[PDB]
Amino acid sequence: EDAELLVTVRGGRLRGIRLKTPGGPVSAFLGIPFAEPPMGPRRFLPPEPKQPWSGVVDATTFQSVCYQYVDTLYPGFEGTEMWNPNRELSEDCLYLNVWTPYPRPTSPTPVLVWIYGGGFYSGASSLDVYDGRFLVQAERTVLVSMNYRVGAFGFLALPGSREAPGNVGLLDQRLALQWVQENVAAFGGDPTSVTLFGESAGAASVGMHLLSPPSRGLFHRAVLQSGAPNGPWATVGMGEARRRATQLAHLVGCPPGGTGGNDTELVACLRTRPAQVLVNHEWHVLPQESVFRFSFVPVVDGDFLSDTPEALINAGDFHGLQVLVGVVKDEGSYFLVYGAPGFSKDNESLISRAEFLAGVRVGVPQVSDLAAEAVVLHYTDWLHPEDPARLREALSDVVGDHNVVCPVAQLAGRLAAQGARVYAYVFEHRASTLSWPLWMGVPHGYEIEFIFGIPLDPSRNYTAEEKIFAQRLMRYWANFARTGDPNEPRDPKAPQWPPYTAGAQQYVSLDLRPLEVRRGLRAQACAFWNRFLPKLLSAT
Amino acid sequence: EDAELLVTVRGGRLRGIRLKTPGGPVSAFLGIPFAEPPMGPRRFLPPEPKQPWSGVVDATTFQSVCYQYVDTLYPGFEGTEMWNPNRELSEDCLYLNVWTPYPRPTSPTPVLVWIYGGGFYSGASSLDVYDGRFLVQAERTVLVSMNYRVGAFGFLALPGSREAPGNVGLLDQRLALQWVQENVAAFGGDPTSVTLFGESAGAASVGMHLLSPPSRGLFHRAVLQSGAPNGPWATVGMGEARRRATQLAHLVGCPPGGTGGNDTELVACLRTRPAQVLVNHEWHVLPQESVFRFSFVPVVDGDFLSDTPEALINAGDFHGLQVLVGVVKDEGSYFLVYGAPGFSKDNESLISRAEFLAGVRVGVPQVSDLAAEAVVLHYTDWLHPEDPARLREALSDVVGDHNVVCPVAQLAGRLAAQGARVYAYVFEHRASTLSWPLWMGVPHGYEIEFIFGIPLDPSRNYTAEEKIFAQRLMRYWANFARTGDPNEPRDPKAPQWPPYTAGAQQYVSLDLRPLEVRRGLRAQACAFWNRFLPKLLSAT
Numbered sequence A, B: 001e002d003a004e005l006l007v008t009v010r011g012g013r014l015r016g017i018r019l020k021t022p023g024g025p026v027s028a029f030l031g032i033p034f035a036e037p038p039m040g041p042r043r044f045l046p047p048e049p050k051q052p053w054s055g056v057v058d059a060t061t062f063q064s065v066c067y068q069y070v071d072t073l074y075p076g077f078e079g080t081e082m083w084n085p086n087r088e089l090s091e092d093c094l095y096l097n098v099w100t101p102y103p104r105p106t107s108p109t110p111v112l113v114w115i116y117g118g119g120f121y122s123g124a125s126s127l128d129v130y131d132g133r134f135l136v137q138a139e140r141t142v143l144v145s146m147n148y149r150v151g152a153f154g155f156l157a158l159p160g161s162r163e164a165p166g167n168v169g170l171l172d173q174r175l176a177l178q179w180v181q182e183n184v185a186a187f188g189g190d191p192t193s194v195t196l197f198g199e200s201a202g203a204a205s206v207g208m209h210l211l212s213p214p215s216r217g218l219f220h221r222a223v224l225q226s227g228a229p230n231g232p233w234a235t236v237g238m239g240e241a242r243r244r245a246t247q248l249a250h251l252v253g254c255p256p257g258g259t260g261g262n263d264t265e266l267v268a269c270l271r272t273r274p275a276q277v278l279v280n281h282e283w284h285v286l287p288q289e290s291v292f293r294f295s296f297v298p299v300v301d302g303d304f305l306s307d308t309p310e311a312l313i314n315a316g317d318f319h320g321l322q323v324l325v326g327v328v329k330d331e332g333s334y335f336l337v338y339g340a341p342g343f344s345k346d347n348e349s350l351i352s353r354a355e356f357l358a359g360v361r362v363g364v365p366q367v368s369d370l371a372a373e374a375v376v377l378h379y380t381d382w383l384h385p386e387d388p389a390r391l392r393e394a395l396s397d398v399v400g401d402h403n404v405v406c407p408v409a410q411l412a413g414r415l416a417a418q419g420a421r422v423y424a425y426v427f428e429h430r431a432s433t434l435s436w437p438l439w440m441g442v443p444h445g446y447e448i449e450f451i452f453g454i455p456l457d458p459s460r461n462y463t464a465e466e467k468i469f470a471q472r473l474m475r476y477w478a479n480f481a482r483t484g485d486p487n488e489p490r491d492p493k494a495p496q497w498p499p500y501t502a503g504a505q506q507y508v509s510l511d512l513r514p515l516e517v518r519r520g521l522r523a524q525a526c527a528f529w530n531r532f533l534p535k536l537l538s539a540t
């Protein structure tokens, strides 16, 4: 009988399970309840801490996935099914998972907390690509991941009211962080060295916890991968959030014909509807045809976010704080097959000049015709203005820069210039197991396999070079979690990773080649997005 | 009294002079009166043809230069003194010069007609760099060059009135072209093969004769050198011309107010003032502080120019026509020492960013602050935004693109795509005798000495390669005048000069190295000027 598989926390006792890796076993505790089930009258409300239980709760398998839209654009396609839920859907989903080395570390170990992405409408901590058994075995750290409510169940906001205040999905993450502060020591983790890291909407979530005082004291380092809280998709206004929430209620028969429409009776009608009914009309509340836009996202409400993320980043002090930001090579190619005209994953997507002009309005929604004209000017090779391959490559850069690269570069510049020591990277390796077409390059979200050491899985057809490449990245992320510096402390031989500053703007490229230092996070393109375009919209 | 130094034209007899070149003698006729002196009551009026004379008019020396401002920015400096008048100033200046080979050609020879530049306010056909003795001797061509009225005496316009119609300086050029049609045969020239070529304001003049029906029938080919009629400095509106003419009259005490008032009394007062008095106040009528802007320029009057140059270029049929357009490598550096803050020819002109932002308002006058912001965005290296050396080259590119490179590319594109066969070049050789500082590169106007074979002058200290480079350029311009094609009619070993089309946009680089074909006359920069910026000013 293994004795390290039974741990007592503040709520009660748990029974873990031993997982095998090619390098050794790891103890895992999957499915720990950190909150009461937010069902019935608790729907749309902030989470309550899990009451203590009797007996031993089985923590040997992942729990249910929160209710969310299921992608059916390409049924049976690996590139999309790998992000779909792998457990049953249920509103009873507020559970977290803890991986710890075997034997348990006798000394406090830094903790890595993972927040998944999925446009705030999907995602789960049980995805095979988020398996933290390889990162914990190789680097001997403590990895924690939680489930937070997505979609309307986590971000439907009627601002002002108390039945649906909004940002409760962010409160699910915060309550999970307080859980780590109160119980990670029982697994050998150091609550004084907590490193958040997420991707896409999870990276924006990490950024929003960085701008919220209550969540600020629950962690010490941050890693934002292909996402930022100041992105044009990450937040929404109080007025737009009320319109989307009321639009969703109307599509499901709320309120009934002849009944008033105040916030109390509107949420009361929404709480009676089945969960799947709300999901079926989630995308029907978006205002326009667009890519990289999602219905229910965090709302600027003055509570969790006292002001807009851009305002909080500008007027913030980030001294004594380390951040690791970065993007992939092709941030926008993934979203073009979700609405952009002429784009298909099954051909070369050699779009025409007319389709490229239509895609700009889809990639950059709610901009004046003059503003769209400026985007066409900057992203047109006027020496080959009709080349389909260049127009395809340009529209991918339009969506990538507007939503990811430039919001991230804006964040990294203000962080470094205001007390924070930040490190920047660009992931440029295309995996050999990638099922997406070649023209997509390195799509949004396909560095997570190497960060979690997935190539080390013997049942997968990765190459020997990619396995070594995965161990490098796991060492980088672990060194940042341990010392706040991705460079090996006992190593002057390997190429150095210089910090990112507002002036030099240095970053490194991550691929099979050794580290290469470059400058400028698309500075020429992002000067248009971060400087000129705001002024162009002010003058209408 | 050689037999070939006495020629009878329709007006009378002329005695020429025999000039000497290192390769042979050339007959020249300098100072032929082609119009009555525009003095007294003839000031501001269109020219009248020269009446027949008795006896023999001495045509052995250059005649008087038209009254013009004399540059005194750098007294004693060769770079500026070379363009200043080298003869006595006088309103009696409407004279032309003819160079013809010795012995006189027995068969009709193509004719080259030179129109000097000088911002429509200065210039003369007697300048040493315009000596046509080397081009005529080497290529056996007939070179003609005339003087036209510049400044207020040639372009002061009170639109509507008959006393000051405007564009009379252009009418001086047209009357000289009718003179070539009626007399160039007496020198061995072919009146059916006339090639206009000019630089800066002369190149713009060549372009305006292409857009005027009465002038089109007087020539068959055109060469525009670092200038275009659609330039933002080459024309003014009828309302602005009236304001500038009235302000000039006010500064010289016209009318003796409150005498009044209409155009007839205003011009009558201006005709009584000495010529030097009008020149002393020419620059005091400009609306703003700017570079590359001139007081009295051609006016869109509806007679000589039925519409704006931009409109006439778009709606024009140019079939059966060959042009040779081109620019120098550094078009804007010359004008920066004339008013941009921080710029001086005696230091490195390492300007700061504050001076760069101030120079943008001087280089691009009368634009909105939003339009200026767009210019700063395109011409800023956002990785080195404060590098003085990069800010210096950026402001030079701003002035060069706004005034020369992009107006030329705009004209060259519409010309090729509407019937005309276009050849484009970029002059990239810096003369070893150049007295301007090094940071100016190849300044505006310093390809003319190589086109005229000035390096062949033994009294000048050119290099051996520059002499061969001059002979190769003279063959280019001569071949274009003879056949409409700069390439040698039979030589296959020399690299080919491909035409310029709106799609491929091919041009060649002119320097000591052989011909090198490139693509794009700064297509990225000129798309901002020719496409986006017009729409940015429509929505103020």
Ligand SMILES: O/N=C/c1cc[n+](C[n+]2ccc(/C=N/O)cc2)cc1
Binding pocket: A071, A073, A119, A283, A292, A335, A338
């Ligand atoms: O037959 N109609 C199917 C269909 C219904 C609803 N949607 C909404 N939708 C937009 C974007 C995305 C992906 N975002 O990254 C996912 C889902 C798409 C397709």
Ligand SMILES: *[C@](C)(O)CCC[N+](C)(C)C
Binding pocket: A083, A117, A118, A119, A120, A123, A199, A200, A201, A202, A444, A445
């Ligand atoms: C991001 C906006 O959350 C998008 C994430 C999409 N996956 C496929 C990477 C989860």
Ligand SMILES: *[C@](C)(O)CCC[N+](C)(C)C
Binding pocket: B083, B117, B118, B119, B120, B123, B199, B200, B201, B202, B444, B445
């Ligand atoms: C052009 C606008 O005419 C300027 C010509 C200046 N020089 C020095 C070349 C005559």
